[PDB]
Every structure is written in structure tokens, then in C-alpha cells.
Amino acid sequence: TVKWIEAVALSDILEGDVLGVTVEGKELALYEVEGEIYATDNLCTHGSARMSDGYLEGREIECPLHQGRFDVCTGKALCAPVTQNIKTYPVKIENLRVMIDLS
Numbered sequence: 001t002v003k004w005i006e007a008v009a010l011s012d013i014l015e016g017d018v019l020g021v022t023v024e025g026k027e028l029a030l031y032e033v034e035g036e037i038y039a040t041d042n043l044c045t046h047g048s049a050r051m052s053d054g055y056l057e058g059r060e061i062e063c064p065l066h067q068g069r070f071d072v073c074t075g076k077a078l079c080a081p082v083t084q085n086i087k088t089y090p091v092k093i094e095n096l097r098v099m100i101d102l103s
């Protein structure tokens, strides 16, 4: 199923920005990487931590706790302590707006 839901106006995403959004009740992180936007779940897989409070360095988001890192394009866990990949979501831009597929 692909079901596109509007997330933010794309002005809201500056360069190399991570932004936390809440869409249909779901907390998601939007990342800007070299002109593309990616989306993951906003909760770390290792603990209670929000990705959007972390540090985005190129395509790697560092959790605000523990030094765990994910690749934002694939969701792959990149270093200890994170071992479970983070869920990624399809993104597109329509206009104008950043849309996310929550299905």
C-alpha cells in the first residue's frame, strides 16, 4: 500500500537538517542529505531516545544517547550499541510539501 501523507512544507527542511514530525500519531525524523529527504522512525531501536535530537553527519544519524548510528537512507545500524535497523519510510515532494508514505 502506498498512502501519501503531507508532513512538512519543504521550506521547513534546511540543509543537513533533521526535523522531528508527528504524522498520524507516528513520530518520524526527516533528514536532508545532499538535496534528498529521507525519513525514519524518530525512536532509536536501542532505547528511549529521539533521533531528531541527535546529530546528522552526512547520511549517518547519531542517536542522542550512546553513540549509536544509523544510515538514514537504508536504516542500517552502523555501530554498537545499535543492532536493529531503524524503520525507513518513503518520501516524496509534491509541490512544495514533503509527503511521507506511512503505509
Ligand code: FES
Binding pocket: 044, 045, 046, 047, 048, 049, 063, 064, 065, 066, 067, 068, 069, 081, 082
Ligand atoms: S538509545 Fe540510541 S544508541 Fe542507545
